[PDB]
């Protein structure tokens, strides 16, 4: 709030424009980063009805329809753990939290239902048990090892998910 | 307008040079911009002070210019290293990294020269129209579970076949396409069929 | 909007792709008469997958597709004389 | 104290001896009126880019 | 006095802008790494150890 100060500053040159262009570049890169990291899928895949995924319990990572927020329980824990004076303005991001949650849910549904075929062409449905058998066939072991131990595998997966949830809810 | 990433560097360089040239015609607090007119109609001490003012201003401007040039050269070197890696693992071999050297299954690439850059031509392999079928984990013939060696057990409604996972080539289910391991008591979803023995 | 006051555009209860980004999810575009509209951007088209216990989809054809990727490599080599710059 | 801002009737209670409060950034936020024992708020008016 | 204040505040603002540029470069590198990890691991099966 000074006119003589501004008249004096006008003698220095074009530094304000330079720093403003730098800040604008930073601000646009901050949105390009998230728009490149999260927006990697074309179609928003939806979760199917009540699901018999072989025995695996994907109840802690799918979007919770109870609250209006499309965030799951782990996302709620992660959001709850992390907690206009002199010309400073905080510009809002381009993508809200709900769009990020929808992108993550679409990616999760694509990885669960289709597998690894929704990143090259069209989504191809396949039972989750056969998908895990193909993963085991890729890591070296055969398919019988999974076809005879799917129960133990699902139990260990559920136990690991529970332990991860407990660790996230205990310490951050 | 597709080659914008190559034009942005030239635009930024031109803008920086123009900003420097325009800053060469400032005062930063003085009697005049040009230095000889300062010492022409003025006493030695005040002229030297006004020259020192311009010296400090131009030093600050040049330091800011050098800092911006270093910051830009860092990103340019990062992009050049990425381009060198993408030139190595695109053409001198077939990569298995998803969405790295092209969208889809990678086959080959061809490099092309460009002003202050490089243009790649990724030849990929994209699937096509699908067709629904019915699959089963294994097949029980004589109390033994038959698992597919390399492929899926595909049925067209009446009979069963075996084909690869990337192309529909139904083959006759025989003992040369499956291996016996275990019995039909553990596999959840075991189906009944007849394995042909040549 | 949530990023300020948009004077000059009209709202619409539709969802298209983001042509001109504004902020907080709001996007603008120039569509038909002709005027400036403001709508909430759509992430994509809903495509549910028909999952079941016994169903697989195997393709029958293929389509070759060549793409293009451009990456900067180097810049212009410059050198400024400090003495001649500062002192004329 | 002096300054320019939008005066609004706030509700933060003050001590019987205190006169004006500040914030973490050491800026004038709330000032008690000298005549009436009421707590007011000082907020700068809108500013931004076009 | 106004010239001295302007010089001091301009130096402070330039230092702030430089720090923000460095932090933005670091964040862009981290975001590129995260995008690579998302594209090569989630949408497939990587054979890269650790
Ligand atoms: C999955 O875990 C949740 C955790 O509370 C539980 O309520 C649900 O019944 C479980 N579902 C299955 C199929 O085990
Ligand atoms: C799945 O395949 C069956 C034939 O086996 C067909 O009748 C059905 O329409 C297919 N479903 C989808 C969603 O393609
Ligand atoms: C399935 O393929 C066999 C080929 O041996 C054919 O004889 C049969 O009619 C086909 N079934 C249907 C429902 O198309
Ligand atoms: C679910 O999948 C199992 C495994 O193949 C199968 O045995 C069962 O019949 C399926 N149930 C339904 C309702 O599709
Ligand atoms: C396969 O054959 C066995 C013995 O003949 C029988 O117990 C079983 O139920 C059959 N499975 C089907 C799916 O028909
Ligand atoms: C694949 O599509 C091309 C393009 O129409 C067609 O010429 C060709 O016959 C198709 N292949 C098969 C096996 O149908
Ligand atoms: C001061 O004078 C005003 C008259 O406008 C009156 O309303 C107020 O109550 C007075 N305050 C005291 C403390 O006497």
Curated annotation (Swiss-Prot), chain A:
Changing residue 52 to Y: In strain: 19B/501Y, Omicron/BA.1, Omicron/BA.2, Omicron/BA.2.12.1, Omicron/BA.2.75, Omicron/BA.4, Omicron/BA.5, Omicron/BQ.1.1, Omicron/XBB.1.5, Omicron/EG.5.1. The record marks 71-72 as: Cleavage. Glycans are attached at residue 57. It comes from the Viruses. Precursor of the fusion protein processed in the biosynthesis of the S protein and the formation of virus particle. Mediates fusion of the virion and cellular membranes by functioning as a class I viral fusion protein. Contains two viral fusion peptides that are unmasked after cleavage. The S2/S2' cleavage occurs during virus entry at the cell membrane by host TMPRSS2 or during endocytosis by host CSTL. This is Spike protein S2. It comes from Severe acute respiratory syndrome coronavirus 2.
């Amino acid at each position: 709030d000074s006119t003589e100060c501004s008249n004096l500053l006008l003698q220095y040159g074009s530094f304000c424009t330079q720093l403003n262009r730098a800040l604008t570049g930073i601000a646009v890169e901050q949105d390009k980063n998230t728009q490149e990291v999260f927006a990697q899928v074309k179609q928003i895949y939806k979760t199917p009805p009540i699901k018999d995924f072989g025995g695996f319990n994907f109840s802690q990572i799918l979007p919770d329809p109870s609250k209006p927020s499309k965030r799951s329980f782990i996302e709620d824990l992660l959001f709850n753990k992390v907690t206009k004076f002199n010309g400073l303005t905080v510009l809002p991001p381009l993508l809200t939290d709900e769009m990020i949650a929808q992108y993550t849910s679409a990616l999760l549904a694509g990885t669960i239902t289709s597998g690894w075929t929704f990143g090259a062409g069209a989504a191809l449905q396949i039972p989750f048990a056969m998908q895990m058998a193909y993963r085991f066939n890729g890591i070296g072991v055969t398919q019988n090892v999974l076809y005879e131990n799917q129960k133990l595998i699902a139990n260990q997966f559920n136990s690991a998910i529970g332990k991860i949830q407990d660790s996230l809810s205990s310490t951050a | 307008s597709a080659l914008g990433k190559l034009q942005d560097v030239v635009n930024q360089n031109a803008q920086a040079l123009n900003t420097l040239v325009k800053q060469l015609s400032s005062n930063f607090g003085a009697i005049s911009s040009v230095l000889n007119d300062i010492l022409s109609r003025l006493d030695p001490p005040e002229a030297e002070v006004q020259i020192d003012r311009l010296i400090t201003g131009r030093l600050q401007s040049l330091q800011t210019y050098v800092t911006q040039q270093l910051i830009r050269a860092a990103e340019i070197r990062a992009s050049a290293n990425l381009a060198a890696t993408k030139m190595s693992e695109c053409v001198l071999g077939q990569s298995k990294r998803v969405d790295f050297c092209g969208k889809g299954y990678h086959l080959m690439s061809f490099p092309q020269s460009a002003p202050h850059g490089v243009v790649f031509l990724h030849v990929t392999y994209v699937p096509a129209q699908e067709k629904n079928f019915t699959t089963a984990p294994a097949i029980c013939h004589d109390g033994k579970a038959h698992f597919p060696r390399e492929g899926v057990f595909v049925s067209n409604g009446t009979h069963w076949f075996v084909t690869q996972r990337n192309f529909y080539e139904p083959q006759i289910i025989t003992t040369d396409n499956t291996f016996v391991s275990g019995n039909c008591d553990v596999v959840i979803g075991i189906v009944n069929n007849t394995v042909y023995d040549p | 909007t949530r990023a300020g006051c948009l004077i000059g555009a009209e709202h619409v209860n539709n969802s298209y792709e983001c042509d001109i980004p504004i902020g907080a999810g709001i996007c603008a575009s120039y569509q038909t008469s002709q005027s400036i509209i403001a709508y909430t951007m759509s992430l994509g088209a809903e495509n549910s997958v028909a999952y079941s216990n016994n169903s697989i989809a195997i393709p029958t054809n293929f389509t070759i597709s060549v793409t293009t990727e451009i990456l900067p490599v180097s810049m212009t080599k410059t050198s400024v004389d400090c003495t001649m710059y500062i002192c004329g | 104290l002096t300054g320019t801002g939008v005066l609004t009737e706030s509700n933060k209670k003050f001590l019987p001896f205190q006169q004006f409060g500040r914030d973490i950034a050491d800026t004038t936020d709330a000032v008690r009126d000298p005549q009436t024992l009421e707590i007011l708020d000082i907020t700068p008016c809108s500013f931004g880019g076009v």
